[PDB]
Amino acid sequence: IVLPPHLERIREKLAENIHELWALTRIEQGWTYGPVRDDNKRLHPALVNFHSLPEPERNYNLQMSGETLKTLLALGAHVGMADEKAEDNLKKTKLPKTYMMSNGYKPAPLDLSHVRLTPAQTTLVDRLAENGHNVWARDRVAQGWSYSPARRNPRLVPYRLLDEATKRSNRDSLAQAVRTLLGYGYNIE
């Protein structure tokens, strides 16, 4: 079931904030920019503005954001605009210059400190995490979705096989995705 047209804008904004959060998480752990990945020196080429990612990487991120939204809908959630003023009123987290990369990129995820999941929303985050298509893309160090010798990609690790710490990282990523939607003024019921 394709993503409804009225959720296409939020698919883009969601992917952008997920990238900012991912980049922050990496930079906290000592990662810095370089054009070729180096896991010993912790250099990563994705520590750039979202719009400056290679098109295939941007497209993958948009696909993953869209599949969070489609999985919410498959779980029966009602997702719709409720507060048209919320987006204008959003602010970004202002990090110190110690978070800026050599290319001038500094992450600026949304300040969602005011957002509080309702019980039904907490339950939807839990059901997203437990859904059979949820994976940890271990090489991307990120939550993602897998929707369709060796056919399967073992590096997309099903949630049910993760150790507790990585389950917690995966679930928290989905919590921030849902809180991002709420921050932009969507109700989720």
Side-chain angles (χ1 to χ4, degrees), residues 2-11 13-54 56-84 86-96 98-150 152-189:
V2 295
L3 187 72
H6 74 104
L7 296 179
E8 282 293 347
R9 304 167 188 187
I10 187 58
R11 176 234 283 282
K13 303 294 199 214
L14 178 56
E16 293 174 345
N17 199 49
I18 291 293
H19 172 79
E20 297 297 280
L21 287 170
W22 179 89
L24 177 53
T25 303
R26 301 284 74 70
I27 288 166
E28 288 169 339
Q29 301 298 312
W31 291 78
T32 56
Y33 171 80
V36 183
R37 185 169 169 172
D38 180 331
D39 286 55
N40 293 320
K41 294 187 175 179
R42 293 178 178 235
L43 306 178
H44 203 294
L47 295 171
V48 295
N49 286 303
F50 185 84
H51 70 245
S52 296
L53 294 168
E57 293 301 320
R58 207 178 317 119
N59 287 342
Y60 170 83
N61 284 334
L62 292 163
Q63 181 191 343
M64 294 300 98
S65 164
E67 288 174 358
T68 294
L69 288 163
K70 288 189 285 189
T71 306
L72 273 172
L73 296 174
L75 292 168
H78 297 342
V79 181
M81 174 59 57
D83 180 7
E84 289 181 17
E87 176 169 354
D88 284 337
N89 286 317
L90 289 168
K91 296 177 178 43
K92 283 165 184 185
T93 294
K94 307 299 182 175
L95 297 167
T98 52
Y99 287 74
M100 182 175 281
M101 307 291 89
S102 60
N103 57 14
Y105 172 66
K106 186 172 71 182
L110 298 169
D111 187 343
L112 302 176
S113 70
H114 58 292
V115 177
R116 295 294 187 287
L117 297 166
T118 62
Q121 290 158 4
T122 283
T123 292
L124 282 164
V125 172
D126 290 342
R127 293 176 179 165
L128 285 169
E130 296 175 356
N131 176 273
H133 297 277
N134 180 30
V135 299
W136 186 253
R138 68 192 302 159
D139 291 329
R140 294 184 185 273
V141 197
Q143 184 276 332
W145 298 99
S146 185
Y147 285 96
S148 55
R152 256 197 74 261
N153 181 348
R155 315 295 293 182
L156 304 182
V157 185
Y159 180 90
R160 66 173 181 280
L161 300 187
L162 302 177
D163 60 9
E164 285 307 311
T166 309
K167 283 186 182 171
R168 287 193 299 270
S169 296
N170 174 302
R171 191 266 186 202
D172 191 56
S173 177
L174 287 161
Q176 299 321 312
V178 174
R179 295 174 82 247
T180 297
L181 298 178
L182 296 171
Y184 274 104
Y186 289 85
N187 191 17
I188 301 172
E189 291 175 311

